């Protein structure tokens, strides 16, 4: 609706992107351990 | 306020960009090792 709502949506989006990013970190660590 | 929250969002995005530099770095490390 307003800036307040839009700002809250951006906060939720980055919160969710951080979960996604943590999952990519896990995958990299798994492959790193396999390779090295 | 909105001004402070907007600044916190910018700082989070800047830190998330540093994280992406790091995950891209790690993928490139493994890719060069594998291929």
């Amino acid at each position: 609706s307003g800036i307040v709502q839009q700002q809250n949506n951006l906060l939720r989006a980055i919160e969710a992107q951080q979960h996604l990013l943590q999952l990519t970190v896990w995958g990299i660590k798994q492959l790193q351990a396999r390779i090295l | 306020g909105i001004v402070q929250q907007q600044n916190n969002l910018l700082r989070a995005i800047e830190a998330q960009q540093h994280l992406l530099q790091l995950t891209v770095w790690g993928i490139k490390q493994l890719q060069a090792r594998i291929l």
Binding site: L11, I14, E15, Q18, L21, Q22, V25, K29, Q32, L36 | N8, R11, A12, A15, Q16, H18, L19, L22, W25, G26
Partner: peptide, 23 residues
């Protein structure tokens, strides 16, 4: 060259920082 040990430490640092901002 960056080591995997420091890579992991920096990941934790920026992730912790974002978590504190979002709180």
């Amino acid at each position: 060259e960056l080591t995997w040990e420091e890579w992991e430490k920096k990941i934790e640092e920026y992730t912790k920082k974002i978590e504190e901002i979002l709180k």
